[PDB]
Design a protein around this nucleic acid. Structure first.
Lengths: 252, 353, 253, 253
DNA sequence: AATATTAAAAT
DNA sequence: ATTTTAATATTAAATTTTTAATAAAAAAAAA
DNA sequence: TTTTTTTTTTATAAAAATTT
């Protein structure tokens, strides 16, 4: 295919988010946009990347190419690329190579990188849209702070969503953390505010480690949508550059 | 070897036993019984049912354990003195005869297990068959001379000379695992001195002063308590365990009072019970002179250590070579002062519930 | 016991300075202030930490509390707090739970941290109050730099004072070293100057690994007061911002 | 008897942090004309030629040909004792085998005299001829460091090609091809970042990678790399030490 | 020379 | 009744070098 | 210039082996 992207830091941040969690990924790329739907390496979590074709400046996908890339290798190849680089993704149908022609932002260095695809089972799980009761829209700085600083105590976060504030409780051998966040609506720039949707008070535990690899996607967005219900695995949604979403799912 | 003394101070006066780290004895010259260490190294360090030996058929597990443990005494900051064992006194004849009966019984059930044909039973019954030899202590004294550790020869049991070394203030602690060193008169005993790689075993330090303050006794009275408990120099009264010994020493304040008022039908006092001679042995043993010994930690002779341990014991050069370099690092650290020398300990407890 | 610290970055820096030297300490918390007279695990160094009640905000202490805190776990709990964080100490009557409430500067993230305690006994040294014969006031970054770079080439400083100034000389198997400083009464500076009071030209050898553990309090005090005399241990005073001191004692070689 | 007072502390720090990764012991060919060094790699593949002429020093006075050699891990650590804006003063004696390293402060506050053990080694002072090269490029040093450390992730070899419209760096590795088709940049407005190529003949043969990653630790010395090659000859990676000299690294391909 | 323990004492 | 006690069994290690994992910096990448 | 942000490097705690 051919998919130029002038904000290549977004794809770099996607791959540095997805490098440490999953390793085999089935990039089921269609003409409707780049999307990925694969589980964990230990089959506990789930990553649902979506990169729509309206966000890319140049897009060309004549054939539905479902290819498989080791994301440690693709993470190293995107670690080569610069921050302001114009990253293109190219593929040929008959030969299994994924060309990543980069562009330095002065039109003075062109970095071409072929990627060895590998055949594996294409995941076709799917998910219906559940009635997500408690939707928490916090900034990603405080979510990275909360998960990275509740990992110091325990291995499980008891997320107690309520009417006015959401509580993040972890209790291990080193103590008992309990981080409350008020529903901020007064001191914000419409990016620093935590808003919680009033449906029902929702309290169920979620493990750490995997939630730290979930919040490894912190530089992708300044907002984290935390949609959850009393039984359903939670959506940790990262809004990808207002052109898609990176959904994370963790079974409680 | 007092039957039920560690549990006695653990369950009667636990303020005396202070558990401490091996790092917390920095700059402390301490005296270690050598024969207990040698029995630890020829029991613990085995392969395949055999002791660790060289190609000449000589035993060398004791030199291995002494070298690595004594190096681990050097990095933790403590300064070892290896008080080697000497001639035991004449009242230990029944105890060494009981030990020889135990080793002969272990030899005959070793022959029974070899007739049955096992491996773990054979290695256990030859783990009980271990005996120190004049060449064992001779080679370990040779090794500690080349390492620079000050070897000492006791004229008695070495717990007595360790107690006389701490009694003169020459060394900080008598670092034997034996209970008899407190009765010999160590003001500081410390036990479980396995200075090991991240074992984090607390050093079970026994202080005699808080024992004699908490139990309300003096030195001869604690001697009488340990004699009634059962030493290795005389037998104990049958039917008198630890708690009854604590009550009788507390309420008569002698041992001849327990001789003169006791029922012979119920608690049988033995007629051959030579408690006064073992009492005088625990008061005045045949110790070494503590003010005439050379307590110095010299520079380790690298060359004779390599020649000795690689021609006679054929040890690999890289391990003992790196061990003597970290001995050199710990010897540059060995001059470092302690803060107890400049400030006096006032808040000994600082309790937190 | 209710101690609200407005500048909780102070307490973050105190337990970062206390993280590596010791791992467990007993807090002598009274109504006069929060105190910590703890000694090294190798029993060579000492920490005299004193936070007075006049430097806290709305301090309260009913009993004479004393709790034994695992300082690595307390440093992990206090590293959850931010730079502009308001830290509220709280404790009950029994030494079981130490609450560490991190009040947000904009009141949006209240972070309650109950902490499990330990019940250990530590040794307190009786420190006399005497006039040291060589009081060296130094910048904190320079004392940090001197310790961390003389430890590359040396195992021990030989701190020598004179009329000219202090002379941090280190020796090793790597190459001989020397760092000399000079007092400046001409510039009349405030934090970057070196102030040396002399009575005797003392020359003492201190272990430099423990001085690297001491230079973790450098963020707490730009002014580092090295006070020493002949055969008396070095006190390394990091004066905290108008609350008290973090005094580090160290035995000479 | 030898004095090498040099005004920029950071740039001799850059030299000795550039040479700690390749070579352990190097013989500093110190003469009256200027400071030189020439030694082969510790794996005996690469060659390092450091030249620091005496014109760019602050004061210089050398008497005899001191072909004395230090451990560079040691002199690297002693130069990490230096400040960034310090003044390096290499001093030496004749009977004494110590390379003194007095580091003057940017102010007049401290001095940092470091003696050093001379682990003397007799390397072979070979005379490398400086002939013409078929490809010489002037590419920016951070950008070349990015190319080396970012084609380090794929293979074990770099196939530099001399195309007419800019130099091409390739790496056929396990993860795939790695062809940076860098372009010819002779722009006026980029003063030193312009990729200036003076090519008389194209050439393309397989180079090394781990040694090039060792070579690009000389990156903060200069903003440019005067990279030079021809057919069946060692590479030149030339780093211009301000106005003092050239740090030419050589790579056996 | 140490610890555990359990039937057997031990009143 | 408990708890007291003399019997009866048991062990006593310390590396260096690897295993997955750690948390403090090295050392840039970017406010 | 100040502050994050990561690979690296680190002493680390468990666990294999055998240290002769």
């Amino acid at each position: 295919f051919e998919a130029r992207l002038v904000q290549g830091s977004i794809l770099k941040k996607v791959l540095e988010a997805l490098k440490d969690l999953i390793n085999e990924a089935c990039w089921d790329i269609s003409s409707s946009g780049v999307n990925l739907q694969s589980m964990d390496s230990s089959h506990v979590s789930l990553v649902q990347l979506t990169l729509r074709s309206e966000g890319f400046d140049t897009y060309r996908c004549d054939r539905n190419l479902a290819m498989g890339v080791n994301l440690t290798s693709m993470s190293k190849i995107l670690k080569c690329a610069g921050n302001e680089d114009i990253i293109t993704l190219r593929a040929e149908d008959n030969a299994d190579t994924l060309a990543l022609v980069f562009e330095a932002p002065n039109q003075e260095k062109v970095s071409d990188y072929e990627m060895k695809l590998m055949d594996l089972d294409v995941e076709q799980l799917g998910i219906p849209e559940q009635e997500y009761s408690c939707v928490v829209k916090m900034p990603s700085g405080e979510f990275a702070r909360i998960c990275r600083d509740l990992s110091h105590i325990g291995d499980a976060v008891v997320i107690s969503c309520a009417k006015d504030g959401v509580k993040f409780s972890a209790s291990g051998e080193l103590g008992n953390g309990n981080i409350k966040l008020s529903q901020t609506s007064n001191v914000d720039k419409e990016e620093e505010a935590v808003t919680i949707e009033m449906n029902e008070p929702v309290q169920l535990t979620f493990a750490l480690r995997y939630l730290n690899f979930f919040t490894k996607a912190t530089p992708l967005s300044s907002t984290v949508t935390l949609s959850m219900s009393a039984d359903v695995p939670l959506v940790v949604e990262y809004k990808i550059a207002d052109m898609g979403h990176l959904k994370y799912y963790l079974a409680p | 070897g007092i039957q039920g003394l560690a549990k006695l101070i653990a369950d009667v006066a636990p303020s005396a036993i202070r558990e401490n780290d091996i790092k917390s004895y920095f700059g402390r010259k301490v005296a270690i019984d050598a024969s207990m260490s040698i029995y630890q190294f020829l029991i613990a360090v085995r392969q395949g049912g055999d002791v660790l030996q060289n190609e000449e058929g000589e035993t060398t597990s004791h030199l291995m354990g002494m070298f690595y443990r004594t190096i681990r005494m050097m990095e933790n900051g403590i300064k070892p003195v290896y008080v080697f064992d000497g001639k035991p006194p004449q009242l230990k004849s029944g105890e060494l005869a009981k030990r020889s009966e135990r080793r002969a019984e272990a030899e005959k059930q070793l022959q029974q297990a070899q007739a049955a044909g096992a491996e773990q039973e054979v290695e256990k019954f030859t783990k009980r068959l271990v005996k120190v030899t004049k060449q064992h202590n001779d080679e370990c004294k040779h090794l500690l001379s080349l390492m620079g550790i000050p070897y000492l020869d006791a004229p008695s049991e070495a717990e007595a000379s360790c107690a006389a070394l701490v009694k003169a203030g020459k060394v900080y602690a008598a670092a034997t695992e034996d209970m008899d060193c407190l009765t010999f008169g160590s003001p500081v005993l410390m036990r479980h001195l396995t200075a090991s790689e991240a074992k984090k075993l607390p050093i079970q330090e026994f202080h005699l002063s808080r024992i004699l303050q908490e139990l309300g006794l003096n030195q001869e009275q604690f001697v009488d308590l340990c004699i009634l408990l059962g030493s290795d120099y005389c037998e104990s009264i049958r039917g008198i365990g630890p708690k009854r010994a604590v009550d009788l020493i507390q309420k008569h304040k002698s041992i001849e009072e327990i001789v003169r008022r006791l029922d012979p039908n119920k608690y049988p006092v033995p007629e051959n019970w030579l408690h006064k001679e073992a009492h005088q042995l625990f008061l005045e043993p045949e110790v070494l002179d503590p003010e005439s010994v050379e307590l110095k930690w010299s520079e380790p002779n690298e060359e004779e250590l390599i020649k000795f341990m690689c021609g006679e014991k054929q040890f690999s050069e890289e391990r003992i070579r790196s061990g003597v370099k970290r001995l050199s690092k710990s010897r540059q650290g060995s001059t470092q002062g302690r803060l107890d020398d400049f400030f006096k300990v006032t808040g000994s407890l600082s309790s937190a519930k």
